[PDB]
Design a protein around this ligand. Structure first.
Ligand SMILES: [K+]
Ligand SMILES: [K+]
Ligand SMILES: [K+]
Ligand SMILES: [K+]
Ligand SMILES: [K+]
Ligand SMILES: [K+]
Ligand SMILES: [K+]
Ligand SMILES: [K+]
Ligand SMILES: [K+]
Ligand SMILES: [K+]
Ligand SMILES: [K+]
Ligand SMILES: [K+]
Ligand SMILES: [Mg+2]
Ligand SMILES: [Mg+2]
Ligand SMILES: [Mg+2]
Ligand SMILES: [Mg+2]
Ligand SMILES: [Mg+2]
Ligand SMILES: [Mg+2]
Ligand SMILES: [Mg+2]
Ligand SMILES: [Mg+2]
Ligand SMILES: [Mg+2]
Ligand SMILES: [Mg+2]
Ligand SMILES: [Mg+2]
Ligand SMILES: [Mg+2]
Ligand SMILES: [Mg+2]
Ligand SMILES: [Mg+2]
Ligand SMILES: [Mg+2]
Ligand SMILES: [Mg+2]
Ligand SMILES: [Mg+2]
Ligand SMILES: [Mg+2]
Ligand SMILES: [Mg+2]
Ligand SMILES: [Mg+2]
Ligand SMILES: [Mg+2]
Ligand SMILES: [Mg+2]
Ligand SMILES: [Mg+2]
Ligand SMILES: [Mg+2]
Ligand SMILES: [Mg+2]
Ligand SMILES: [Mg+2]
Ligand SMILES: [Mg+2]
Ligand SMILES: [Mg+2]
Ligand SMILES: [Mg+2]
Ligand SMILES: [Mg+2]
Ligand SMILES: [Mg+2]
Ligand SMILES: [Mg+2]
Ligand SMILES: [Mg+2]
Ligand SMILES: [Mg+2]
Ligand SMILES: [Mg+2]
Ligand SMILES: [Mg+2]
Ligand SMILES: [Mg+2]
Ligand SMILES: [Mg+2]
Ligand SMILES: [Mg+2]
Ligand SMILES: [Mg+2]
Ligand SMILES: [Mg+2]
Ligand SMILES: [Mg+2]
Ligand SMILES: [Mg+2]
Ligand SMILES: [Mg+2]
Ligand SMILES: [Mg+2]
Ligand SMILES: [Mg+2]
Ligand SMILES: [Mg+2]
Ligand SMILES: [Mg+2]
Ligand SMILES: [Mg+2]
Ligand SMILES: [Mg+2]
Ligand SMILES: [Mg+2]
Ligand SMILES: [Mg+2]
Ligand SMILES: [Mg+2]
Lengths: 155, 119, 73
RNA sequence: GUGGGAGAGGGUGGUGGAAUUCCCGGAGUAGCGGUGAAAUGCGCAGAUACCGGGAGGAACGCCGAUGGCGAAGGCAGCCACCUGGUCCACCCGUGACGCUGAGGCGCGAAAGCGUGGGGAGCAAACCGGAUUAGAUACCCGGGUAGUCCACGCCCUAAACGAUGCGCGCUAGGUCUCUGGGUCUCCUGGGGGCCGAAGCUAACGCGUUAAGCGCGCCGCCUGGGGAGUACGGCCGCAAGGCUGAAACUCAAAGGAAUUGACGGGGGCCCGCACAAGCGGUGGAGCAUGUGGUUUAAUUCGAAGCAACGCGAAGAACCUUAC
């Protein structure tokens, strides 16, 4: 994006919770454009969040996404001599993009044998402060803040 | 220990380090710090961050002598001079005043070849 | 542009060659004990050249500072 | 001549404050320092940072300039003394007493030399630490001569405005330093800028000429060889001044032009990077290629822009071996 500022894409809200955030997550779960199979998965897993929790899946989902959002991350930047890992705030949008990307990633690292189970358990575990995703989020946050010495490279 | 309550805080900023010295009203050091006292080693001692840490290390160690307010006295020009000023202000210690007293010669000794095209 | 108020304006009659008039020479020095530019003194080539010399005489007499530390920062 | 003026002009003596280094005292503790990053180095025999006292050397911040003085080199804290140049006004005195100037004599930055003194900081050489393919460098830590003073030498330079000195003549505008005047302005000396005419290869110069003219001095005559050799003179030495030849080249060269280029600048693009999603590189195989092999493995395609490319159909044919 050299010329413009690149506007963001809008997504048709969920055919269920009528929520856009859900569709985002659906697309991250998608693969080879199999949006149907992708949608199923989130839903089955969405059900499994109940009969395991008396709570609504959506509230669970939306709060997992929340604990996985990184508030600081370290980016590179050469300053004559080498590259200095510079810490810095993460934009509201990248937080979301990162959070969801990370969930699907951690989810698929789980041992649970079938997809919907994996997304489900990762969703849950995340919601209460644990799980692959949250780990990542904390390794990142720990990276930044661990390089406070290069904070003066703002940008 | 001796109990001072009010003294002086000298900041010595350099493009290589920042080192804070806290003294009694007569200029006698009570405590001190630096990017080296804190865990920093090479080039990071000059960092404004390190200066912050060194400045805070200094303040705290000065609370032990029961000191409260001080007169900041800045010397030098170096990345991390102002962070030290701020660090002290935000540290229980009351900053009654800031004063720059960086020494400058009325042209005396020939500088090192590195700092020439000056005198 | 320094549009404060030339030190010459904010003052009147005075012997530019009087090295003892501390109360008036004092006015041509900065926050520091530095001699102010024509920019601020408002004087003129010839006037300033004579001021500079009288101020330096006052310094050696201890009536004026060579340098003074800056407050604030 | 008389009366005024400005100035880092020169020489001698005195003297002030800032800073660096060292020494002494206090207080205080684990580092300081340094770089791209480091290390050598320094520090518990207590450094760095801080306060007080002392010694010494060298240089003068602000003012300070686009400024001033000088014949040039050059001259910058402040005080006194000794001393040079110069500008203006008054038209007072002399009465062409003028200009230039081979040789001579003097002066002449830095480095360097001799004798003696001094030595804080800086720093050829040098000793070390890094860096690099190497690094007899660049960077870092040290450090002798020297840098400072006296006296005596040396006599060079991008000693430059790369523009010899003097005088007369030829629009103006604008800034500035210093003097005089009826003080919006005028008039004299100096420092800049833009420009009339004119000059110039061009760039540019232009009352501060590189214009128009006269006087006198110095100097040039293609490039390399060579500022060398020889001689002479000068020097303590280093080396300076004067300054060739054989041989050899078709050039060397000045200014400007259009390009291209830059580890120059500015503004701006492209799946160029970044952000991201999938993949190649590993396996098996398919296909093209290199290589090798063969009687032949027909030929071509070569970094991007050759390699599932000519081959949108090689069993014979095609097919060129
Ligand atoms: K000048
Ligand atoms: K020698
Ligand atoms: K000298
Ligand atoms: K001499
Ligand atoms: K006048
Ligand atoms: K022309
Ligand atoms: K030009
Ligand atoms: K000779
Ligand atoms: K001789
Ligand atoms: K010589
Ligand atoms: K460019
Ligand atoms: K690409
Ligand atoms: Mg350092
Ligand atoms: Mg006179
Ligand atoms: Mg003088
Ligand atoms: Mg001193
Ligand atoms: Mg001591
Ligand atoms: Mg002690
Ligand atoms: Mg050691
Ligand atoms: Mg011990
Ligand atoms: Mg010792
Ligand atoms: Mg010291
Ligand atoms: Mg001291
Ligand atoms: Mg000594
Ligand atoms: Mg002159
Ligand atoms: Mg000169
Ligand atoms: Mg005179
Ligand atoms: Mg007459
Ligand atoms: Mg007569
Ligand atoms: Mg000489
Ligand atoms: Mg010399
Ligand atoms: Mg000598
Ligand atoms: Mg000697
Ligand atoms: Mg000695
Ligand atoms: Mg040194
Ligand atoms: Mg080596
Ligand atoms: Mg060195
Ligand atoms: Mg020149
Ligand atoms: Mg005319
Ligand atoms: Mg003019
Ligand atoms: Mg003029
Ligand atoms: Mg004039
Ligand atoms: Mg001038
Ligand atoms: Mg013309
Ligand atoms: Mg032309
Ligand atoms: Mg002109
Ligand atoms: Mg003429
Ligand atoms: Mg000649
Ligand atoms: Mg020849
Ligand atoms: Mg010839
Ligand atoms: Mg010749
Ligand atoms: Mg020679
Ligand atoms: Mg001799
Ligand atoms: Mg040319
Ligand atoms: Mg585009
Ligand atoms: Mg495109
Ligand atoms: Mg990319
Ligand atoms: Mg990838
Ligand atoms: Mg493969
Ligand atoms: Mg073949
Ligand atoms: Mg072959
Ligand atoms: Mg052929
Ligand atoms: Mg082939
Ligand atoms: Mg193809
Ligand atoms: Mg055949």
């Amino acid at each position: 994006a050299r010329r413009r500022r690149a506007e963001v894409r809008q997504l048709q809200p969920d055919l269920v919770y009528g929520d856009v955030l859900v569709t985002a997550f659906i697309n991250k779960i998608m693969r080879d454009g199999k949006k149907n199979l992708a949608a199923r998965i989130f839903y089955d897993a969405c059900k499994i969040i109940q009969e395991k929790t008396g709570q609504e899946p959506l509230k669970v989902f939306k709060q997992a996404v929340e604990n996985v959002k990184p508030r600081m991350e370290v980016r590179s930047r050469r300053v004559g001599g080498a590259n200095y890992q510079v810490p810095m705030e993460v934009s509201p949008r990248r937080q979301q993009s990162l959070a969801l990307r990370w969930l699907v990633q951690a989810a698929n690292q789980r041992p649970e044998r079938r997809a919907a189970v994996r997304i489900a358990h990762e969703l849950m575990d995340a919601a209460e402060g644990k799980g692959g995703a949250v780990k990542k989020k904390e390794d990142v946050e720990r990276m930044a803040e661990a390089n406070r010495a290069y904070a003066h490279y703002r940008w | 220990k001796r109990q001072v309550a009010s003294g002086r805080a000298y900041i010595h900023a350099s493009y290589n380090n920042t080192i804070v010295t806290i003294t009694d009203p007569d200029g006698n050091p009570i405590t001190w710090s630096s990017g080296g006292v804190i865990g920093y080693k090479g080039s990071r001692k000059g960092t404004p961050y390190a200066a912050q840490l060194a400045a805070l290390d200094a303040a705290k160690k000065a609370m032990a002598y029961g000191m409260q307010s001080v007169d900041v006295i800045v010397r030098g020009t170096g990345a991390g001079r102002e962070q030290a000023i701020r660090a002290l202000q935000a540290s229980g210690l009351q900053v009654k005043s800031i004063v720059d007293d960086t020494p400058v010669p009325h042209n005396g000794c020939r500088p090192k070849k590195k700092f020439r095209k000056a005198s | 542009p320094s549009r404060k108020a030339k030190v010459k304006a904010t003052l009147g009659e005075f012997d530019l060659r009087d090295y003892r008039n501390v109360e008036v020479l004092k006015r041509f020095l900065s926050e520091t004990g530095k001699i102010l530019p024509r920019r601020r003194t408002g004087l003129s080539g010839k006037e300033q050249r004579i001021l500079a010399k009288t101020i330096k005489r006052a310094r050696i007499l201890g009536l004026l500072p060579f340098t003074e530390k800056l407050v604030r920062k």
